[model samples]
Target: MPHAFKPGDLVFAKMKGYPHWPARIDDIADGAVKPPPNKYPIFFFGTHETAFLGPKDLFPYDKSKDKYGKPNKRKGFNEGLWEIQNNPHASYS
Candidate 1:
């Protein structure tokens, strides 16, 4: 089954340089996840954000996509392609 996220829920984006950075679900599109030239749903992490281009980028527990394509397992804080989870605060807002 596909996981659904609500607005204000904590999220993360695992990019090349930074892993486990804090973010939140700013919005959820009704059909944003659909493929074929449509931009995926966006999760906002303060000034940073990412569009979940595919299922490989979506996670319910932690947003980090494992090297072997699994969930629950997380990459280290300093590991590349890992997005550390964090709570929203003034500094991040």
Candidate 2:
């Protein structure tokens, strides 16, 4: 699949081992086509830095599960293709 963001778009990047923190995509996207299907470039709102995060637990963190007014752990299995088809988040081709 393609990246979940593009240049100038905001995302809650879980870079490396960091928690969900605001970040901005730093590269002009290549038209939603998976080029080097591996890593993505991003800028941290944390420090003066840039990084590429590769993960297998990606899910559009359900904001509805936040607690104490912040994103907290939800209670559900990770959404898969089947789960997604049942509740697709506008994943288009």
Best-matching candidate per lDDT: 2
Error of 1 at 83 (Å): 15
Per-residue lDDT for 1-93 in model 1, tens only? 545555555545445554444444455448644434433444544434445543344344343434422233334333212333334422332
lDDT of 2 by residue, 6-55 (tens): 45544555645545544445563568434346666655442434567544
Candidate 2 local lDDT, residue 25:
54
lDDT at 45 for candidate 1? 44
RMSD of candidate 1 to true structure, Å:
8.0
In angstroms, give how far residue 29 of model 1 lies from its true place. Answer: 8.5
lDDT of 2 at 33: 38
TM agreement with the true structure for every prediction: 0.36, 0.43
Which TM-score value belongs to model 1? 0.36
For each candidate, the alpha-carbon lDDT, in order, equals 0.42, 0.43
